[PDB]
Predict the 3D structure of the following.
Amino acid sequence: MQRSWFNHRLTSAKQKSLLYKSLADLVQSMMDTFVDPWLERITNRKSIFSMSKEDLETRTNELGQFFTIRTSNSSSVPMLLQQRLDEIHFKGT
Amino acid sequence: MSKTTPTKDSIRAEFEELVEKDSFWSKFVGSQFVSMLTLFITQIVYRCFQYADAALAEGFISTATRRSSILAAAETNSYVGTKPTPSSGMIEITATSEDAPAVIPKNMPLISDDQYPYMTMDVCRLVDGTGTVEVAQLEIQEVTYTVTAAKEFLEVVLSKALTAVCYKLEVFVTTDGKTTQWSSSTMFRLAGSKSQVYVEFYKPSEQLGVRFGDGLIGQIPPEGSTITLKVWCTNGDITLVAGQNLTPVDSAANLANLISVKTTTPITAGTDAETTEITRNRAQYYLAYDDQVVWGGDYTYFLVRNIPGLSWVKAWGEGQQEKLDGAYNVQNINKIFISGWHPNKSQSELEEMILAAFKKVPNELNKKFSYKEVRKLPFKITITGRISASLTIENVTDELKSALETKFGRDSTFFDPNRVGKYILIKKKDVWAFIETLGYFRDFYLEFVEWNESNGFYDFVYLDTENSTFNISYEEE
Amino acid sequence: MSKTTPTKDSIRAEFEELVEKDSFWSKFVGSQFVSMLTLFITQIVYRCFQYADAALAEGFISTATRRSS
Amino acid sequence: MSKTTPTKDSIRAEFEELVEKDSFWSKFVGSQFVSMLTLFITQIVYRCFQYADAALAEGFISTATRRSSILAAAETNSYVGTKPTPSSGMIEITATSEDAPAVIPKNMPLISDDQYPYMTMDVCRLVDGTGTVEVAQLEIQEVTYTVTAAKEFLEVVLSKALTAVCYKLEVFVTTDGKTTQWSSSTMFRLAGSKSQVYVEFYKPSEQLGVRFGDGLIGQIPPEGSTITLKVWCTNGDITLVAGQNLTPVDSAANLANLISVKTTTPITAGTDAETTEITRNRAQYYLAYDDQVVWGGDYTYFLVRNIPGLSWVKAWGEGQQEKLDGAYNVQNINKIFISGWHPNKSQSELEEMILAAFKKVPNELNKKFSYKEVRKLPFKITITGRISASLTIENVTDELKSALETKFGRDSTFFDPNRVGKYILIKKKDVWAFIETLGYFRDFYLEFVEWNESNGFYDFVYLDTENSTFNISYEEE
Amino acid sequence: ILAAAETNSYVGTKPTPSSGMIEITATSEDAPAVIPKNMPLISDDQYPYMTMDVCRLVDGTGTVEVAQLEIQEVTYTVTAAKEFLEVVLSKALTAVCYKLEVFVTTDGKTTQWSSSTMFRLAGSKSQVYVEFYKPS
Amino acid sequence: TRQYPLSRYDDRNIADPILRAELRKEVMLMCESNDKNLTIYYVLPDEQYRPDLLAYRMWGIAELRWVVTLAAGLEDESQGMTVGKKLKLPPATWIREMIRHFQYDGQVIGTLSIA
């Protein structure tokens, strides 16, 4: 999620160096593959609609499976939980 | 790519084919230092992945086991726990001097031999200088503040030094010399424009806070007024042996040397603060509770919150009871089945506590409750098998009996392991799983003598540990 | 439960002692070579670590300070 | 016990006081005369003393620090330390002229910019002027020896450089035009003239060499016969980056302008000489890899470690067969029956591999070993109950069947989880515990159908996952 | 002699605890009649003693054999990669050592490792270690 | 020899993420408060990658990097922050004192009335 990110605190000659780009892009790939998806999932968790699936069913089954609807409309799962949570004030009807 | 746990060899691989596919090492071969550099960064990334796993654990209240995170989530849920209650003992008083009044005024202070403050809950009367009274470990704190600026949602903060012993709170607003005891409704419910309302809450650093209205919803205290927080504190279940004398202190020290007080009953009936896991569980079940008293699960949760000491509670709705009975009984209409078990109180006692609770709780509308006694259903277990010969058979039998009593005893926590009103029963699968988790026997068999299946309303099935059979043998090693 | 990680100067110290394993490169320690590479890896791990920490902090309702949050 | 000797200043002091005996030479003390003679005698005695001390210290195995000392220790332990091995790889060969021969044979050197000799190991076929051959940094240094005397284990040592870089050795005993090859062989066994070759030897002068034995231990070459020693030497780890050109010399010196050698395939990953202490440790602990098998459990462990993919292997001696049978057997006399399972191998295959390993490991005396049939004993499980509606019955069935076949199936790894040569019986409690740990149960009950109990010797008990009865329903209203 | 013995790859035997037979009479009712496993004890001559089993009181009265046993533990964390991982002990504790236990806790998973001398029956990944004396 | 690596500057000396969280909470409160004991300075174009560069120039320490990061609300140094934004820095010793109090006796935090 960073392009040429090691292009700012590096002298230009060492930037155009042969092996420094190798180390830079290998570590950029490594972070891309094993740190960022956690950032994406936490950013999804920020938003009620953005949450990834794993997070959606995690929040679903934290309370229990008896409090949800077994639906395949995964896009609707966020809104369905939104109504299920905002209805608590009008759910005697 | 994925959040699945990788392996160091896999990381080393991905690195090495990345390196070889990259042309810069092709132009520069002979970098055997990148080998252990890859190793070191591999452990670095492994530690980073462990940190990420910790982040996932802390990102969910279910996965997070920290008191701080649990309290943060509970405050998001707008839920708070219960304070510890004082322990009360029964004491006798014999004045040593004639000038001592036979009627001791209300709330006279007292100190115990173990240096603990105690307070009378009522006026003590001496029958010719002799009287008896119940006194609990109770103490007094007060904080007074004066409003100096005008902020919406007036806020007041407390210190753990006092909240660690706080039991009861009182809020007084003294405006221009007029002191009013304000009422509290959570989340500003039923709060009008000028309602004398405030909301109290926890704070993940175990802080305690209270907030006032916006004028639109809740009365804003005026500038120049004062706020008084009275805090009745206790140290929890402070138990002291009977037969020891008591020393009055403070204003009562004058009569301390004139009146003799001796306890006759060990100080009991005290409760302490509840544990972090049970707070988390009650937080989830309150999130289910949705801040409203509507259904039977909510009823049970509220009742167990308000009545410490009960083993468990059970309740059934009008429709459930009618389905059980097979009739559309008009008398049973708007009638809620209730029952409960207490490790120390009888069924009649429990019924009268619950009746008193429903009486003094006005949060109901024509809600009729029918209580039935909880019926115990003991059954025996015959465990027959051979075990390792390395341990004493007597020791093994004692350990097994203790474990069975702990797990599926008459007053075992297994029935209410969550303390949110969810009463559960014992299962044959549960027993066999528990004994396999013990794993001491190599081969074994369970005979469920007089096994019965609970109706779920009031039947109380439990193991008869003392009558249980232990056909324990030594398995050849 | 909780998460912990050692400080920057620490991680530098154990990093240099573990790279001191091979005798042919063990002794570049003390040089601005090793210190620059070490500060580079420490800065990148600091970014990932502390920014994940900030993300999990902002994940809470009362911790939101940014207008967007 | 122990040895002691007084220090230098001491020995000087008592020496001067004892020479002070004769009055005519006693007072020369204090002069540079006596001090110089005294320092001379003290230095010579210092040499003899502490060099005897150093000799006795180096006489110990773990005290050896010198390369020569530790190699002498390794020779005494009949082990050779891991010598450096040059990197080997591919090089491109192009023809610069029609005069370039399309065939370039093995056994030709290549001169680098540092004149590092690059031996070729194949035949380079130029296809349209383009050819390839395996190239590695090596050289062949040739010396010779003439039989001075017919002394048993006659010593023939090499120079320090040869001892340092002797990566490989070739010994050609040439007599009057007849050349044979002799190698270095240890671990002597079997009566008679085991072989006609030399043996290894090292000298603490940092020298390596050979010993010409007599009798049934080798044979002495005749006096005047030549012994050619061709030593494959190298510089240790070799780095060869693509993008360089070589300079063939000698017979190919005239071919250098006709044939161009271009580095295209990188060549690296050579080895060097490791540390003295670790070489000593490796030498002193390499004796673990000796095929020292002394019990049937050792046999089973070694068979398991030598044949991958074995489900399990287990032997049963005469006593085991006796206790299996419950009575005396006229046949079970020194007879050991070995059973086992391999998912990819049949009983005949298992017996064949067992027998092959028996030949490969010649360690037995007065005991016969046979292969015992393995009898499959499948059994079914009938689980009955209901699950939550959140689950899918088909998927749960699939997952449970997969896990049960993995853990307690006919091709499981539970029989020998640690790969030590053991067979562990599958138990009903174990299977039910496995499914409980899997935790796809809500309210179920298990029965075992056709429980074929296994003696644990050769019968193959396993769960019949395919035929298992799964009366799974939904915990509905 | 120790140097030669280590060349031989031989080590001696540790001293064993001395055990006596004792009676126990609790002076208070709250004391359990079953004493849990491995409760510590000190002797009048200031020596640590340890129960070898669970003590049972017959109405507050019991008897048990207890030996002069004490507990030590050392924990270390691996920081670098060396073949033939090595751990060293001090005579201060080896002068009284009687029994040894080796636990390897890898990423929170603790395994009690077995020991086979001179790496006998040791596979590639065998949880094996060899213990030895050293002439000092 | 006796040696241990450590440094008494890290705000993250407190191992609790939640405690670190309210710490950054009140420091943000103060920073985006308009208090006069704060610095008055705008953004520099190169601060996109290096927000702590200004911290180095005006203080010589990089401990203020998280301070400026929370002040600007940056998602990543790859992205930039608008040049000219109002930035405020309090005296460092003040932060040192508050954190010292919070990690010895940061118990009452809010307001102490009477012992």
Observations:
- Chain B touches chain A at residues 1-3, 6, 14-15, 18-19, 22, 24-25, 27-28, 41, 45, 48-49, 52, 55-56, 59-62, 284, 287-288, 290-292, 294 (CB under 8 Å).
